[PDB]
Amino acid sequence: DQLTEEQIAEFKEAFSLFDKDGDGTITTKELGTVMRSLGQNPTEAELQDMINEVDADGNGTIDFPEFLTMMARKMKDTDSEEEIREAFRVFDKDGNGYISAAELRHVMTNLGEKLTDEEVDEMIREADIDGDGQVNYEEFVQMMT
Ligand SMILES: Clc1ccc(C(c2ccc(Cl)cc2)[n+]2ccn(C[C@H](OCc3ccc(Cl)cc3Cl)c3ccc(Cl)cc3Cl)c2)cc1
Ligand SMILES: [Ca+2]
Ligand SMILES: [Ca+2]
Ligand SMILES: [Ca+2]
Ligand SMILES: [Ca+2]
């Protein structure tokens, strides 16, 4: 089938979270910044190894079609569940088990991202299956699939 404009917009927003300077490519330095904000501490060589798996043309960076190719592979690492829980803990800064729009705003400002209130509210709505206005652990996990 064909992607909708909403699906293209969602892929574009996800790419922009890594592409901090907006030049259309994701570098090892930009990938490292995101991973550190989600509780990880990869070395530069490990970041290069991760990019190399996705980088098809071999120019050291990830472009939009390479990013989409990555998503279409449904690839996973051995400690995926631990990394997803670690990332979940980062967002839920008040320890109540729900990620609020305020807590998502906190992680985005720490990452150096500039997002409007409508963009933050749409990200919550995108993941909020039960409709309580916040993202619980199961919704945060389901979002990854
Ligand atoms: Cl905790 C977690 C688990 C899985 C993923 C997915 C994924 C899904 C959607 C999107 Cl928009 C980007 C990546 N996934 C697919 C491939 N890589 C490998 C790597 O994941 C790095 C990573 C690991 C752990 C954590 Cl906590 C965050 C990240 Cl970004 C990676 C991610 C983004 C780019 Cl641009 C390039 C690479 Cl190689 C991860 C992401 C986070
Ligand atoms: Ca970039
Ligand atoms: Ca490339
Ligand atoms: Ca919370
Ligand atoms: Ca919810």
Query: What is bound: which ligands?
Result: the ligand Clc1ccc(C(c2ccc(Cl)cc2)[n+]2ccn(C[C@H](OCc3ccc(Cl)cc3Cl)c3ccc(Cl)cc3Cl)c2)cc1, calcium ion
CATH C-level category of one domain: Mainly Alpha
Strand content: 5-15%
Strand arrangement, major sheet: 1-2
> Kindly, what is the distance between the CA atoms of the first and last residues, rounded to a whole number of angstroms?
19 Å
Structural class, by secondary structure, is mainly alpha
Subcellular location: Cytoplasm, Cytoskeleton, Spindle; Cytoplasm, Cytoskeleton, Spindle pole; Cytoplasm, Cytoskeleton, Microtubule organizing center, Centrosome; Cell projection, Cilium, Flagellum
Keywords: Acetylation, Calcium, Cell projection, Cilium, Cytoplasm, Cytoskeleton, Disease variant, Flagellum, Host-virus interaction, Isopeptide bond, Long QT syndrome, Metal-binding, Methylation, Phosphoprotein, Repeat, Ubl conjugation
Pfam families: EF-hand_7
Family: Belongs to the calmodulin family.
Structure overview:
This protein is mainly α. The chain has a domain at 5-72: EF-hand (Recoverin, domain 1, Orthogonal Bundle), CATH 1.10.238. It is 59% helix and 6% strand. It has helices at residues 5-18, 28-37, 44-54, 64-71, 80-91, 101-111, 117-127, 137-144; strands at residues 25-26, 62-63, 98-99, 135-136. The strands form two sheets. A two-stranded antiparallel ribbon has the order 1-2. A two-stranded antiparallel sheet has the order 3-4. The two termini are 19 Å apart. Residues 19, 21, 23, 25-27, 30 line the site of one calcium ion. The PDB classes it as metal binding protein. The entry lists the keywords Calmodulin, CDZ, metal binding protein. The assembly is monomeric. The entry is titled "Crystal structure of CaM in complex with CDZ (form 1)". The protein: Calmodulin-1.
